[PDB]
Amino acid sequence: EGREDPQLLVRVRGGQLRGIRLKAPGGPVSAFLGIPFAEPPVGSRRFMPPEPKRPWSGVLDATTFQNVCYQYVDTLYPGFEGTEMWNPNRELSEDCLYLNVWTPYPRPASPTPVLIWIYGGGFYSGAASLDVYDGRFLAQVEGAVLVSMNYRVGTFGFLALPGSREAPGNVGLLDQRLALQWVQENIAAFGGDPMSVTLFGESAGAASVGMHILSLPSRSLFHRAVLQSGTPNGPWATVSAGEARRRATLLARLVGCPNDTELIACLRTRPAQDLVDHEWHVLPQESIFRFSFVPVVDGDFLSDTPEALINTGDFQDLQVLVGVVKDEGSYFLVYGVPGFSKDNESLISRAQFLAGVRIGVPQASDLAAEAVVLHYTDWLHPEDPTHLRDAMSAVVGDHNVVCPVAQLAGRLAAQGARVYAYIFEHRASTLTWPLWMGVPHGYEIEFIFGLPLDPSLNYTTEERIFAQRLMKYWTNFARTGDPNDPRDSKSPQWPPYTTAAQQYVSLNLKPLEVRRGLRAQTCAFWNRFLPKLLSAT
Amino acid sequence: EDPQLLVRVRGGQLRGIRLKAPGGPVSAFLGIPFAEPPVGSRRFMPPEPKRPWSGVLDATTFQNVCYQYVDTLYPGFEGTEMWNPNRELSEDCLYLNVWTPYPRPASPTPVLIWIYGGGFYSGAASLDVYDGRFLAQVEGAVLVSMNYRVGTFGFLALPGSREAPGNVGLLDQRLALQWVQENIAAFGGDPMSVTLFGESAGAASVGMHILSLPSRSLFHRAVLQSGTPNGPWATVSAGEARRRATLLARLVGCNDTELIACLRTRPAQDLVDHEWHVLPQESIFRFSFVPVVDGDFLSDTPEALINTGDFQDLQVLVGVVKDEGSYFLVYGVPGFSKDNESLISRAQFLAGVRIGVPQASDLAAEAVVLHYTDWLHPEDPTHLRDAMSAVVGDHNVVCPVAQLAGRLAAQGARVYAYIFEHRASTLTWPLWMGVPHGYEIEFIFGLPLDPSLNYTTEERIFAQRLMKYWTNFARTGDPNDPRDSKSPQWPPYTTAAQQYVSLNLKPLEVRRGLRAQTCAFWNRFLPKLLSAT
């Protein structure tokens, strides 16, 4: 040391760190980027649970984001911002278990409520270093301590031969847990309060949060949780041990590998790209909103299905914020349902709707499919292309997010949790996806993190004010278990979601409007009737 | 003698009677025999034409009511008694009634023929709500109504037997239609313009005449109020008819010939006493002896026939009342009564769905319950009550009607559809029942025009509108007044726009889709489901 900035030097369990002073619109923040929290899970450690990072010597430079965990990269629309913004923005490597910290500058004087972000990406993709996950705005404007970690995705994170020692499954979730332990031991050195840790995540990140809620060793590592557009329950976030075994075995065959020990040993000799290049090929049916390698119900991390666990758990101690965007499903249609594209209006035919339902509900028998079609058909205009288009999107949206969220909120509420629910209805003026996609999956995130406060990003003034409201809701919830501003009454209030009143709020440019019932009739179909229908055919 | 009251028909001379309607006199000829009394060995048999008679047959009085069960659930109560027989019971009951204006029309006049309902187990053409004088006086109509055999006497069947072939109550109707062709011209009626109209089982009967070729040369237009030949209650298979007839026989102590012979020795009331005991399930809106798919009067099931028929020649007016189901709940479903608000629990609601949909599997009944529950208030007694009613009305009338309208329109027919939403100010059933099954009829027949019935002025004005639509439909096949040039008008029901009108105190309103989402469930999904279970 000596001639550097004394307000950026910090020590953690593993050694000394040097961070960097970043500019946010309203003033400086402290960033500590690319802190290793585990031994690199490379070589003989592929598919293995992470081990704690061994201490380093000297001052580790923590001024740049580290490698992105090895993953599939999206090529559907080359150079198109709407997809590229989700793509990896650092080198791909199996050596990727690093986390990031943003704090006020100078670091706070008294212990400060901590937010931990867990990114989504269907458990096959994602990075804590993407622009839309920039912690500088929350840190500066709200004083937050924000932590985001990389966790293994795809095969490296979730390939499992359940019961084996060399590929037990869920190691990507264990990566997340280790970072949560890391925060408990170390965040006080940044001025963070380890006794006030709130998780939040979107999509698969949201399901991840749900799984930490349902896994008792994680429960002592956080106090509050936010789930954006994702649930541990539902049709995509988990797979049985049997199906995980089948998928892992198939992928092995596809890449040359013929006793679990031998199979896995062969898999470890494969280049990481050979695994990625065959990842999408092990799905049992033509599907959208399905992902090959995801958490497995192993009887360990998850002692039973999420459905069983949320049905029979005590949650009096728990405060959760859950919600959805207006058009959860539209995004997914163009990655598989014939007739859909980002470059036209995607008006489809009844025939294409019927084919789309089979793809969006890949597990449905012919009867169950017909039930879906009859429910979502408008029988005053059963062949109107526009209606069939938006119905296809609603089928995928409802089945995958909105009704799993509706069930989660309902079960948690019935079992003592304090639940707050929202629907996010504002479409970013900057959005590059077509209008027909409305407010797609993932496009509330940039507002929660407060990107519109960045003048160079060309958001409107109203969007700027909006983002600020949202940042207050999330941070007030992190601080108190309550999104409402205590020092405020004039602004409309956000009631808890109950089973009796089923209240939730609209989040848009207008002030909070309280609504009752979260697709109540339609989710009764998905959550109550469909399972019995499938079970009888 | 008044020459206006003397008519000669092919069977001999009739004398009728002059009756007062609020705006003037009408000629009525009541109690005209159109068949040989279907008594003794002629029980369960096809009717035969009435033999000629000497002198002048007195036709100034309603004849006897076909032998039937009499309702006793609420003894003395106007709301039920108004449907009970108002003349003596007799198997000797095959007679019809004719109202015409006074004096007899000088031009041949459109004929309306009323077929009563009563679940094929009851009914009579002599009920006060079927009084034809108002239509005859105000609209100058010639109106005809016949008694037809009901219950075991009209529909007990041993398919394929000669002595109980089934459907004879429908042949009773057909013979009266033939009679009208042969004789109505003597009353001033136009045999070349005959419109059937009927309600509930009557509507269904009308529907079956549409689907039976020998009936088609006897009428030109049809009105089906709150009833269809398709659906769950209007017909039974040959096998199920055989089963019920055999069970009834067993129950009263009885080779087909020998079975039916013993049945013919049984006093009438002995059959009625066990009539309601041959149903396969604990049911409501389900009747023991109804038309049978004999492969003769009905060459195939009504759904097969309306699915394949050519109805380009046809004009039809069809409709429903607001609360088709309410009436029936108090006749079986625990929790329901006319004497309290019938607020039920969720348990009772599930229990009542099994009774309202007797043929549903566990899964199918769960589907009904899940579809009709308001999940914003899944346990609210008022919603559950009103939903129980809706299940029964939608399953049995509204969706069957919507299917018929749809298939007829798609296959060339000219269709007009309504929903009747005015509740009679004189109604004696409780408010929660709303506008029950049957309570449009008194308005169509023009009863409010009678000062002594204490209807309101607006209800009088409304009855005159309804009589206008119905008679205009009879004259032209189009219920719209060809002189009233003010919008809106009653548009044709089509498969595309699915337009129908509301009938109430306010001017016609045009709506689209007759419970389309809900009827898609009943008409399209449920049958896949019962089948798959």
Ligand SMILES: Cc1ccc(C(=O)NCCCCC[n+]2ccccc2/C=N/O)cc1[N+](=O)[O-]
């Ligand atoms: C190997 C592979 C490759 C593509 C898929 C696949 O389903 N692609 C469709 C696009 C999904 C959307 C991703 N996304 C975009 C923005 C914000 C969040 C998210 C994810 N939220 O969870 C699936 C696989 N696979 O699992 O085999």
Ligand SMILES: Cc1ccc(C(=O)NCCCCC[n+]2ccccc2/C=N/O)cc1[N+](=O)[O-]
């Ligand atoms: C032997 C018997 C006795 C009673 C029933 C039965 O279902 N009773 C319930 C009441 C039905 C409503 C009758 N009704 C009332 C006013 C206006 C029209 C109508 C009928 N429209 O069609 C059924 C049987 N049975 O069939 O065996």
Ligand SMILES: *[C@@H]1O[C@H](CO)[C@@H](O)[C@H](O)[C@H]1NC(C)=O
């Ligand atoms: C939109 O484009 C896709 C791919 O180019 C195509 O499959 C689809 O038919 C198109 N739809 C319309 C309505 O142009």
Ligand SMILES: *[C@@H]1O[C@H](CO)[C@@H](O)[C@H](O)[C@H]1NC(C)=O
């Ligand atoms: C904002 O608008 C300016 C106008 O010149 C443009 O140059 C810039 O690229 C825009 N930024 C974004 C993020 O769209």
Ligand SMILES: *[C@@H]1O[C@H](CO)[C@@H](O)[C@H](O)[C@H]1NC(C)=O
């Ligand atoms: C209404 O009355 C009937 C019989 O009198 C009874 O069985 C039923 O429980 C009552 N309903 C209510 C809601 O009290």
Ligand SMILES: *[C@@H]1O[C@H](CO)[C@@H](O)[C@H](O)[C@H]1NC(C)=O
């Ligand atoms: C009409 O009301 C009067 C009482 O004002 C009553 O005397 C008469 O009997 C009523 N008529 C009918 C048919 O109810």
Ligand SMILES: [Cl-]
């Ligand atoms: Cl005689």
